[PDB]
Amino acid sequence: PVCLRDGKKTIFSNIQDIAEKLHRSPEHLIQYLFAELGTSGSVDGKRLVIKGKFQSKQMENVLRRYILEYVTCKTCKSINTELKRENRLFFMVCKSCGSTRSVSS
Amino acid sequence: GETEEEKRKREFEEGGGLPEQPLNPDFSKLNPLSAEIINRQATINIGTIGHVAHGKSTVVRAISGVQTVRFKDELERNITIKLGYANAKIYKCQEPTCPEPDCYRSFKSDKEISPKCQRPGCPGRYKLVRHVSFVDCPGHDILMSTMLSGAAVMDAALLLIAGNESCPQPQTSEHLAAIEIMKLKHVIILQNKVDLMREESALEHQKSILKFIRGTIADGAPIVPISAQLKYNIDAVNEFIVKTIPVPPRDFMISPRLIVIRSFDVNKPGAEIEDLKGGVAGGSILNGVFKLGDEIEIRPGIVTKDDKGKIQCKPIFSNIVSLFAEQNDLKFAVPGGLIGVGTKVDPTLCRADRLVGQVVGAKGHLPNIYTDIEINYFLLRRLLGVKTDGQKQAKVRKLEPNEVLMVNIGSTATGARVVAVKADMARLQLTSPACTEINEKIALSRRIEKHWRLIGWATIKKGTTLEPIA
Amino acid sequence: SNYIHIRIQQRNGRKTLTTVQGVPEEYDLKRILKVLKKDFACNGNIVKDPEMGEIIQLQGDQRAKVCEFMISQLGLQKKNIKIHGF
Amino acid sequence: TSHCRFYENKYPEIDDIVMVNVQQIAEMGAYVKLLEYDNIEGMILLSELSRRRIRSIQKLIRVGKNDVAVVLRVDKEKGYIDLSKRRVSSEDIIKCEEKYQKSKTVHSILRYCAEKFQIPLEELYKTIAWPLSRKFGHAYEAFKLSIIDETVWEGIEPPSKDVLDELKNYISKRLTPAVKIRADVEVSCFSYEGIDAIKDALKSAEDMSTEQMQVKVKLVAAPLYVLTTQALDKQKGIEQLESAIEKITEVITKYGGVCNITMPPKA
RNA sequence: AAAAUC
RNA sequence: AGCGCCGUGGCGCAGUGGAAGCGCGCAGGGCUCAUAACCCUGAUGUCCUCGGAUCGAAACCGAGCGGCGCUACCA
């Protein structure tokens, strides 16, 4: 994770690659990040820019938490899951295994 | 360039579709393997058991393809309370050329009599050897009433074990033992996690499981490596089901009866109530056929407590409007299956978990409700379902008077109070009524660690009856 | 659900304030503020914030210490509670 | 043209509270136009301008916006009005803005009438608005009572009957307020026959529906039956739903079951 | 009045 | 599946029927030695999309969408 510190501003010009390599839609990742952290930041076209004093360790640990609880299967070693909505909630479904497990917080 | 719907419709019309059952066929020549029965109704109830978070519904979805409706927005994810019903049809390939392991195939119950073989290069047509109903019993350590009700419903079993986890799972042993309590022995062992295991590790797991099932009553239990995710070794499961499990004895020479396990209210919202349907009780029919249009009575029914604390029980009389045994309404019913008997019962009797584990009889018979029941009980040596980190798994104690014990009499889940304890017999007072028809094999669970833990088995030998008031 | 985390708000002259957001109701709050005050020697507030919840504001900059109180008073998890650098 | 005031007189009375549009401040205060009396410029000086001292001489006073002011003096000789912003109570500001929006609504309606009819608004107010503000004390209440009672237009000479037709059309399009009354009932049946009981009870319930008051008892769940009714007067729906309660309880006393209520008729 | 830092 | 709430300019409330509101932010400036506090200045919208009465609508309605809330898994 590449975290650009510019005075009062915290920039992630690489969050697009994070979304692509983790097979996750960007807006879901932003929703997760701002449910974890208490900020409201903007997106420029590809890069997530926020106004705060945030360290790189926090970004790394939130990425690892997102990987463990959302991205990779909690019963198998697979990323092949993606985001769907089964009655209205987010219900994760996989592609290599297809198991029905869902985490929404 | 045909669309998928057109190809499916062509295969359906080629195969004959689903012929309507005759309204009143000769029932003296009608076996559970007849075409009018086999193509449109289940005759064998096979149920899946396993420990928590294993994929019990996923394996059945792999076999059948119909979802269990994991509902309630909280049971979506962790555990279900009500059972998971499913229908699959066992079709064998009639051409000897294709391999015997791959000859079999379980399809959905929407399929026709003769679907073509999907194997690349096989022009043979599939023959329906049997259609089986599926029962999924939740395996959580607080919800065991539903598992014992299902076990009373059960006819065949499928046990599931995980690979990467610890070999001695207490809950799988609990499910197994509960199955052998209910006069059930056709149990097939399934290892689900083989994909995330190595060549050697699965061998030690199978050795440990083989040593595990050595002293229990069931001995000849085949072991199947499956994948609820890769969806392979399904035809082997079907072959083992057809070969190892024959039909338990069931014919039309016994009086009709019903054991309702679920409540279903047909109240499709939004539309005008000038067009509604009947209230449906989902129940297993272990004996006695039913035909379109009958007069029946739920024996426990209305349970009221008058101004003195005494119990009054009024059977719920109802005319049967429909019998949703399968996707299309049937003219009759076949014992050894789950059928939704839709009667004129008000849907609020079927709204919530109200018609859960109750006994129902056709007119012309009077199943007797009982308040105090004499019971002959046998117990196991030690508690089951409890994890002990290497110290003498807890031993089952002996009963004591005036205590609440969850006495699952078949499907009926009651909290009974023990009035007296003897060497092998005890007297139970039921705050919730139960009706005794023939034997109604009982299971018992005791509160030792907060939640219930099964202890042993029992049989009804006597009882103190109550006269129903019409 | 009901995740727990602590934040730091700075002030003039290096002085700092600490906030734990979300507190289980199994143990009451005044009985906990009493023993927060002694073990911390810092002023504390059970403040109401809409759509946020009851917050035990404390003075100073202490995170391992509020955590060390949490491990003993009611918290038995040490997994849901999150520590923020800021 | 749009010039006439909403009230009766031309120059303000004493100690009355109105709402003013700010236009300009030079050195003594804001001499700004009125939007409740006749259009005239009144002076709000600084020590009569802010409850707070004067720290933000640009914030609390906004050039081109309306805020509540109070009449302190009226020189009914040449042109002068004295107004103050501080001398308005915290509760009073709400009634002041209520009256201002009242005036603006009636002014907009009559301005639509004048723009469509090319009649000066002075004649529209003189021939109509002031007699209604004399008979009822207000012209808005008079429009509201015209909706339910035409007799408010008796005794007043309109400039033209087509103006009356257009204004009644406009007030019917705008000032129209069919109150939605919902009740919900719990069928708690345990008896033998309850579905035909529900069918015929709801058939009777829908039978009493009138051409003007229509009832469709809908379903949201097995026990929860919702009765939705529209009441043109708010008093007929409650009687309809009480009659329905009678019908369902009478039907259920004979079949054997029981029907309980959660929410009786409430708008 | 409220006064903060240093 | 059914009925209630909502649709920013970054966030919330307000008007809903003369056509772009305020505060919170954000950015800059001023106050000063210097930080807060305080005082000025901005730059962002078919206030979700499609139709309709209407000189006119973002506002009044509706024919659909997205997200919340309850009934409750509704054979």
Ligand SMILES: Nc1nc2c(ncn2[C@@H]2O[C@H](COP(=O)(O)OP(=O)(O)CP(=O)(O)O)[C@@H](O)[C@H]2O)c(=O)[nH]1
């Ligand atoms: N590795 C692996 N994970 C699986 C498989 N099937 C299901 N899972 C995963 O494990 C969990 C169990 O699946 P689920 O169907 O929810 O469990 P269950 O067997 O219904 C739970 P209970 O035993 O209490 O009734 C899910 O989170 C799912 O993602 C499988 O074949 N392999």
Ligand SMILES: [Mg+2]
């Ligand atoms: Mg299940």
Ligand SMILES: [Zn+2]
């Ligand atoms: Zn997976």
